Amino acid sequence: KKVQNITKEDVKSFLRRNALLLLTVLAVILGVVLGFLLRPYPLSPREVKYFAFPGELLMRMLKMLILPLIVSSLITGLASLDAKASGRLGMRAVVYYMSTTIIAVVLGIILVLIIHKEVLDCFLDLARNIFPSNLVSAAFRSYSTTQEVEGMNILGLVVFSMVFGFALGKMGEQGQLLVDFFNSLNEATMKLVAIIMWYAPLGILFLIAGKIVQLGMYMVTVIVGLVIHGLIVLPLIYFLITRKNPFVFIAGILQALITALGTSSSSATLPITFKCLEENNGVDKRITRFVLPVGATINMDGTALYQAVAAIFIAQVNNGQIITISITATAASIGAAGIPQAGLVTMVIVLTAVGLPTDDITLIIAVDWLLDRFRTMVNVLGDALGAGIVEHLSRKELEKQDAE
Amino acid sequence: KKVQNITKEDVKSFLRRNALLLLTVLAVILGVVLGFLLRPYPLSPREVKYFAFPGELLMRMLKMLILPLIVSSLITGLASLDAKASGRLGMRAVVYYMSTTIIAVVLGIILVLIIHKEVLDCFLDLARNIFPSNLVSAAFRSYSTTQEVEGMNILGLVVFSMVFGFALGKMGEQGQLLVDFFNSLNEATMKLVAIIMWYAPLGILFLIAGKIVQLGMYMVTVIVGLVIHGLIVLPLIYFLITRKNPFVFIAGILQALITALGTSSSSATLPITFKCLEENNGVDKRITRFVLPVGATINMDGTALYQAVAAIFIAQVNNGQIITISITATAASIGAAGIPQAGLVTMVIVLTAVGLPTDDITLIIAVDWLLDRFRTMVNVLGDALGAGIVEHLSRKELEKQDAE
Amino acid sequence: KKVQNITKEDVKSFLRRNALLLLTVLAVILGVVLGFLLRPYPLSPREVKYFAFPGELLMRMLKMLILPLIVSSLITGLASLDAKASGRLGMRAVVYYMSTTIIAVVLGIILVLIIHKEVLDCFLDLARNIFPSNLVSAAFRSYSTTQEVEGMNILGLVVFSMVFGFALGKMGEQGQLLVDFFNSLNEATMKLVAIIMWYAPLGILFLIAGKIVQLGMYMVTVIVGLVIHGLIVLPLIYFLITRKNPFVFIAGILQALITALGTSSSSATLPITFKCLEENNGVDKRITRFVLPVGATINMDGTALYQAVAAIFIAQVNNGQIITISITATAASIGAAGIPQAGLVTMVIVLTAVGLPTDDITLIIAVDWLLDRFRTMVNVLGDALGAGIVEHLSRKELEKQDAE
Ligand SMILES: COc1ccc([C@@H]2C(C#N)=C(N)OC3=C2C(=O)C[C@@H](c2cccc4ccccc24)C3)cc1
Ligand SMILES: COc1ccc([C@@H]2C(C#N)=C(N)OC3=C2C(=O)C[C@@H](c2cccc4ccccc24)C3)cc1
Ligand SMILES: COc1ccc([C@@H]2C(C#N)=C(N)OC3=C2C(=O)C[C@@H](c2cccc4ccccc24)C3)cc1
Ligand SMILES: N[C@@H](CC(=O)O)C(=O)O
Ligand SMILES: N[C@@H](CC(=O)O)C(=O)O
Ligand SMILES: N[C@@H](CC(=O)O)C(=O)O
Ligand SMILES: [Ba+2]
Ligand SMILES: [Ba+2]
Ligand SMILES: [Ba+2]
Ligand code: NA
Ligand code: NA
Ligand code: NA
Numbered sequence A, B, C: 001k002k003v004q005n006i007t008k009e010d011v012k013s014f015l016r017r018n019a020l021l022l023l024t025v026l027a028v029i030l031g032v033v034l035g036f037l038l039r040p041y042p043l044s045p046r047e048v049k050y051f052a053f054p055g056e057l058l059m060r061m062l063k064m065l066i067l068p069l070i071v072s073s074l075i076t077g078l079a080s081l082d083a084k085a086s087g088r089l090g091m092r093a094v095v096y097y098m099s100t101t102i103i104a105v106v107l108g109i110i111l112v113l114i115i116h117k118e119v120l121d122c123f124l125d126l127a128r129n130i131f132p133s134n135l136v137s138a139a140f141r142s143y144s145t146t147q148e149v150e151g152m153n154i155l156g157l158v159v160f161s162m163v164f165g166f167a168l169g170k171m172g173e174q175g176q177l178l179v180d181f182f183n184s185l186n187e188a189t190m191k192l193v194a195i196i197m198w199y200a201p202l203g204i205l206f207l208i209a210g211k212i213v214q215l216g217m218y219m220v221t222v223i224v225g226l227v228i229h230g231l232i233v234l235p236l237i238y239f240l241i242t243r244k245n246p247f248v249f250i251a252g253i254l255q256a257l258i259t260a261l262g263t264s265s266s267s268a269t270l271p272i273t274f275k276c277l278e279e280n281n282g283v284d285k286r287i288t289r290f291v292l293p294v295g296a297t298i299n300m301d302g303t304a305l306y307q308a309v310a311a312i313f314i315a316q317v318n319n320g321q322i323i324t325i326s327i328t329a330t331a332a333s334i335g336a337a338g339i340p341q342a343g344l345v346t347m348v349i350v351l352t353a354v355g356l357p358t359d360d361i362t363l364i365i366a367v368d369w370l371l372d373r374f375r376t377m378v379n380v381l382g383d384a385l386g387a388g389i390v391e392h393l394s395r396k397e398l399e400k401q402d403a404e
């Protein structure tokens, strides 16, 4: 293959086709250079916000499109499938989600054992958010007992849109108008992400430039720990089921992985991960609208590995019970939101379970932002390969719907 | 009939059909037992909230479904009827609402005469809420001058949805798409209340268990006062108009009356009262979507009797003007919200009208919760019998629509 | 013409046809009389709010209908036009908007030369509001860095609805359902403004009555300055393009100009300006839904003249750089909101540009309310004549759509 590469054949065709994909890679390279060049800070945090503003605009655009996407996706997705067909596709997703989150936490504990307001209120608020008291409120607000904190209730909307799509599925002819209504809205918001995809290189540049303006050994532990899980463990899972090339599939969702390294939000990168699967990897719309929104807030393999490493790292300094780490890190992974720094916020639960003090989180916070950008990528990669595996396992159910 | 009852015939068929209805009755019996058994409180109010949490979840589910129900109901209801046909059905509802609220206040004053920030701002805020400045805000917020307090503006949504449904009625063919849109959404949210109906026994149990964790004579006055109005006065009104058995009709809405005793909210129990009339009592959808949402926030016969008893009870301790009590108690009844403890909040208006001090409300508050659960039932019973009476009086208008 | 007027012919026919238009003129005459008669104030501002309450209700009704109008208008408007056809109609609107705002600021500076938290944060917040992070939030909230202040994000909704309508235009057949959905909603909210049009005389009366309960020379400068621009400059622009009578056109939108003098909000008067053009002046719905919502928040000729006069008036007391006044007054005109007193709030930007102190705004505030009612009229007049000019310039594009 090395001798085959020195041919220097068709380089112009690659630059013309992957123009936007190369620009985002160029944005990361220029974003690290520009940020480190302007690293001596004679500027107030107020002036840092002005500097990272072109990246802040991209976030506003992405955060905008999440709500009409999540809602339209599940309502059409759960209506496109039959009562038993949705349960089978669901069980395939649940089995995949639980396995990948438990294998990540096992890899996380092994790698850290080789290389050296209440907790109950955090559980009740999750159950309170799964059942929102007002849907209009849920679209822009979340519950946090002291009462209703700012920011979208993604979980409550996924749960409602699921049941709502299933109810229209039972309605048939009457329910067809609303299913056709939400299918128009999904394609309408998808045609809107295509426009936002061109602003992305300008945004990502200033988004990472503004953020670069014993713990060192720990940083390597997670970063190395994620490379093993994401580039060796997860691609082999795809090859074992689909029997197809995983690194060719990972290349299609590169624009979704590069944006994750910028935003650090599974929810914010979801409208682009939808565009990456449905277009370049030619994944079925009926399953992307099924696996992708659920995996965004639940399938967090990168967080579960981070929750296992950072918890034991706290015990290393402070100087059976390791089984409860693998349980609560899996529990906090599914719980945690697909938004930035939501990895350390849910670490309160994993530390209290073993008896470790929660005041130790302050030590990690400083380097969190860099690991957050890497863990989001593993969370995006999980749903992306997660859709492809479900599609390959449910082609029989998909062929029955194509009859008409 | 006593000799006819000792037959012991078909007991298995009753347990299999009314399985869910018996479970809610069992939930009330178990809810009183469990609450009184755990009555010695070595637990903080924080721990009481944890105990009544399975009941708190049911409330979140019910409060959720009120907004898409109220909106879809009136828009289709006012569009299903003609310009003059809606005015006639309206006049039948208004006449029924005013009569039942004035007869309840007359029964209330008689029973209490036998057995021993500004008021203007409370009126202006009602007129401010009837015309909401922002519909999206109205869906989760209400006005309260100091500015816009938390909680749905049910009145503003009923008023807007009414006019909006009437405007589509005039639009005909163009307006048919939106009428067909909202009819899908109404049946979609109705299929969602069927699912919530199974959680109800688990909720109601902890909802009443958590709440049980001269004023004594007063408690009997209202409780006895409501039994006369609800079980003797109101069923005879149905028999005088429909010429049909009222206690057989009351049995159909038992799941709506039992839930009222738990939630204490006419709005929260409205999605279940809709399911009780449309199914078991086979009431027309065109009139339930017309009488039920309006009666939920206006027809409060149980509150009007409570407002008459509690006002004179305050004068009994403190030691012509009784005509103003019957007027303001009727005025506060129509005003007051279909939510818990909204009976004492509107008592400020009835006490200031006669000159009695508003600081006397503090005496009643302690026992209010128990009477609140009983008065809600009389408010639910009023709309339920209220729909059946309107349906019986408007069959000619209903037969004209069935031609097509 | 003077001899032709003494005929006293058909006076009964004018009172029967323009009954509502004469009532609003009568409301202004009675509103000035009633307000000045009750001018000796032995009443607290709390009692002033009670007095101006019948005008406050009209505002609640108007503010209500703006959000479903703005959203439905642009989505159908941008879908009714072709990709290149919307760009041409857009360029015609942009050219008209920039010319009228630059000619108003030139007239403003001439008339004042004959007759004697940060500024950057105000720019960033505009760019933050053009891209809203949550559409449900945008419908009732706006951004203001300290974080998200109360009141509708009109600009974010106009920008989203524009792109959304354009995306459905590309969708064709699939996108037709949603275009037909939003066309029903536009006509539904238009049939709702017809009802609010009858409350208008009662509202306008108390709206202006409550508001009348060197700076004197300055007041005349702007008032005279607006009469030249609005009644002499702007009608001649219409006559130069359309070749039709402008004062006959101004008569059709009189109910929209009289309401502006009451509300002082281009957004609040927009649902009535829509009813005035589409009915009395028989303007095409495809262009009113295009020019009117954009012009409401951008085309502010009355504000640009006010921003030029009041800035130089501040320099007159305090005792090349005049070019920056004409630039920033145009910049603040497009920026400023179509709501009351938004003329002095954006004056911070025009005063800082030349070096003048922002603390001088306190001097003008006292008389602002009267000039605000007059400048809103010039902003309403600008969009109204602005639609008629675009319609006359784009009849070829309109005739192609009428083929079907
Ligand atoms: C709590 O966190 C979740 C929510 C969802 C899921 C699965 C999933 C994915 N991915 C999607 N899109 O739909 C369904 C799933 C089911 O397991 C069940 C499946 C289902 C099948 C049949 C009837 C249903 C009725 C209502 C809701 C879901 C239903 C839907 C997994 C965990
Ligand atoms: C203020 O508190 C209320 C609101 C509503 C009602 C009545 C009602 C009930 N129940 C329902 N569903 O609709 C109408 C009612 C009318 O009286 C009038 C009726 C009506 C008839 C004809 C045209 C209308 C146009 C707009 C609104 C209502 C209209 C509608 C009574 C009191
Ligand atoms: C920033 O403040 C504004 C926003 C809008 C406008 C113009 C306008 C008016 N009036 C309306 N109704 O639509 C469009 C305009 C364009 O210039 C462009 C035009 C347009 C043409 C072709 C494709 C488009 C795609 C997305 C958005 C607008 C598009 C739409 C002017 C200034
Ligand atoms: N940043 C992660 C969540 C986390 O903070 O753990 C994501 O968005 O996927
Ligand atoms: N609880 C009553 C209202 C009240 O408190 O008076 C209801 O919801 O019907
Ligand atoms: N009152 C003006 C805006 C301003 O205050 O300048 C309008 O609504 O058009
Ligand atoms: Ba089907
Ligand atoms: Ba019809
Ligand atoms: Ba077309
Ligand atoms: Na997983
Ligand atoms: Na998660
Ligand atoms: Na009544």
Ligand code: NA
Pocket (backbone or CB within 6 Å): B296, B297, B298, B299, B300, B333, B334, B335, B336, B337, B338
């Ligand atoms: Na009421």
Ligand code: NA
Pocket (backbone or CB within 6 Å): C096, C097, C098, C099, C100, C101, C102, C299, C300, C301, C382
């Ligand atoms: Na202009």
Ligand code: NA
Pocket (backbone or CB within 6 Å): C296, C297, C298, C299, C300, C333, C334, C335, C336, C337, C338
């Ligand atoms: Na403006």
